[PDB]
Amino acid sequence: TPTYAQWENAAGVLTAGLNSQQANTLHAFLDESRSAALSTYYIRQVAK
Amino acid sequence: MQALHLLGDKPYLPLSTTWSDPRLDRAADITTQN
Amino acid sequence: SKLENYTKVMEMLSTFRPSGATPYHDAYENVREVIQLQDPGLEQLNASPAIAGLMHQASLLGINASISPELFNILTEEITEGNAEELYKKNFGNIEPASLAMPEYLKRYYNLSDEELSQFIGKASNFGQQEYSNNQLITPVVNSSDGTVKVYRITREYTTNAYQMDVELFPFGGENYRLDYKFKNFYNASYLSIKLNDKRELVRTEGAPQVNIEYSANITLNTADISQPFEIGLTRVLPSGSWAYAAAKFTVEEYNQYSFLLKLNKAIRLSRATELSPTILEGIVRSVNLQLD
Amino acid sequence: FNTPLLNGQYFSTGDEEIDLNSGSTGDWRKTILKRAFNIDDVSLFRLL
């Protein structure tokens, strides 16, 4: 199975081809997903 | 948000329960009080 | 976390299976979003047979369904009694299954909606075992005067004339049960009488029960009953007053929630990842296995 | 170059050496260059 570095490399190569408008939408979607994941992890593992 | 925490936790209401789909005939006699 | 750089943190997050909306594979999400921007639906990929054939179908296709590789490891797992007691350690860690049994706590944990949770809790009657195995049935039951989920083990024990029949019991509510039974031999009953033990007659059916027919009854069994290793005594009474009596005991035990919560977890995470209705997934899973697995 | 940040890596002038060969499959710095110039690897080498 592909290791995380392979995935991150593919993510970067694929992202380099996008335009400003599509990059803006991609970054907004990524930020929303990251916020949800980080909130759940913080609640489970860091909250007192 | 000020009104939101005043209302508090929305109550959870278990969708199905002990109620057993009774016949109208029998529901009538159960409901008919002494 | 003792992690200094961003990518080590996202590697940690990509495998943090014990939390309720991780695992979150960020590079995979970036790749999926970039693909669905640049070529929605892989029309150009599928229009090129060589590229599509360098991939497996299930790999390109599983990027549509938003199944991450760790979520694929979660969903693939062979949940059974004899590993559920430690796969609970893998998949939930430190939250007690008694707390996670409460619908409010679990809904907060998955950040579900009320109507979204309600259909999974209806589906919970399917989440159990679908048929008896080793004369045992282990099942969740609502009994929900407080919403809570309780898992019951029913253990069958054929006591009397087991050559007459098979008999099976399937709860659906608090002190509310379906009893199923299927005869092996024919006796021309004037009526069929069925009792708690040979004592409290729970149902009676007129005429002769036939061979190879699965009969059913929405019986009730009460606390003072199911605390016992009670018998269920069935009795085909012939017009002569002779009978093919047969019976089995049914021990009712309260049981751990592990195998229930692991199946509910698989169902919730699959439904959320594929944005498919739980009814659709239930209609798909039955087309592979008669056990919901 | 620096915005948006790519995988939490900050780009700055340094003494390290970056390869512009298209078939070399360079590191994240090459991806930063491609994203900044909005060009692919082959055209990047052609521009070089």
Distance in angstroms (rounded) separating the CA atoms of residues C228 and C252? 8
Say if B and C touch: at least 3 Cβ pairs within 8 Å.
Answer: yes
Distance CA C120, CA C32 (A): 28
Contact C167, C215 (CB under 8 A): no
Element (H, E) at A28: helix A20-45
CA distance linking residue C168 with residue C82, whole number of Å: 24
A15–D40 CB contact, under 8 Å: no
Burial code of C107-143, b = ≥16 C-beta within 10 A, e = fewer?
bebbebeeebbbbbbbbbbbbbbbebeeebbbbbbbb
Pairing, β C200-206 against β C231-237 = unpaired
Residue C166 bridge partners (DSSP): C182
Nearest to C114 by CA among B19, A38, D25, B15: B15
Grouping H, G, I as helix, E, B as strand and the rest as coil, residue C3 is: coil
Quote the CA–CA distance of C69 and C31 in Å, as a whole number.
13
Rg (Cα) of chain A, in Å, rounded? 14
Sign of CA pseudo-dihedral C200, C206, C208, C212:
negative
Which residue bears the tokens 């009978």? C243
Find all residues with CB under 8 Å of C2, minimum gap 6, and list them: none
Number of other CB atoms surrounding residue B11 within 10 Å: 7
Q: In chain A, what residues touch C2 (CB-CB under 8 Å)?
A: none
Q: Which of A36, A35, A32 is nearest to C21 (CA)?
A: A36
Q: Is C277 helix (H, G, I), strand (E, B) or coil?
A: coil
- Residue C152 burial (C-beta neighbours within 10 Å; 0-12, 13-18, 19+): middle
- What are φ and ψ of residue A40, in 5° steps? -65, -45
First to last CA, chain A: 36
Chain B CB contacts of C126 below 8 Å: none
Experimentally determined by: cryo-EM
CB atoms within 10 A of CB C4: 7
What length does chain D have?
48
Separation between Cα atoms, residue C31 and residue C29, nearest integer Å: 5
Q: How far apart are the C-alpha atoms of C193 and C195, rounded to whole Å?
A: 7
DSSP letter, residue C164: G
Token pair 């921007």: residue:
C37
Residues from chain C that touch D4, judged by Cβ atoms under 8 A, are: none
- List C233's β-bridge partners, or say none: C195, C247
Burial-class residue D20 by CB neighbours within 10 Å (0-12, 13-18, 19+): middle
Residue of C22, C89, C94, C18 whose CA lies nearest to C272: C22
Resolution in angstrom units: 3.2
User: Taking the CA of residue C59 as centre, how many other CA atoms within 13 Å lie in the half-sphere pointing to its CB?
Assistant: 10
**Token code pair at residue C226:** 């199911």
Which tokens hold the place of A3? 């290791």
| CB proximity A33 to C under 8 Å | yes
DSSP alpha helices (H): ranges in chain B? 2-7, 24-31
CA distances from D26 to A15, B3, C208, D23 (A): 15, 55, 82, 8
**A16 and D31 in contact by Cβ < 8 A?**
yes
Distance (Å, rounded) from C-alpha D11 to C-alpha D2? 6
* C26, C72, C107: best to mutate for the A interface, most A CBs within 10 A: C26
- Paired tokens of C165: 């029949």
**Can you name the residues that pair with C247 across neighbouring β-strands?**
C160, C233
- Geometric angle at alpha carbon C180, from C179 and C184, rounded to 5°: 140
Residues 6+ apart with CB under 8 A from C41: C64
CA distance to A8, C69, C72, C259, per residue, from C8 (Å): 12, 18, 22, 33
Report the residue of D5, D7, D28, D40 to disrupt the C interface, i.e. the one with the largest count of C CBs within 10 Å.
D7
Question: What pairs with residue C183 in β-bridges?
Answer: C165, C211
Set of chain D residues whose Cβ sits within 8 Å of the Cβ of C6: 7-9
Instruction: Please give the Cα distance from C51 to C45 (Å, whole number).
Output: 7
CA distance linking residue C137 with residue C160, whole number of Å = 20
C118 Cα to chain B: minimum distance (Å)? 6
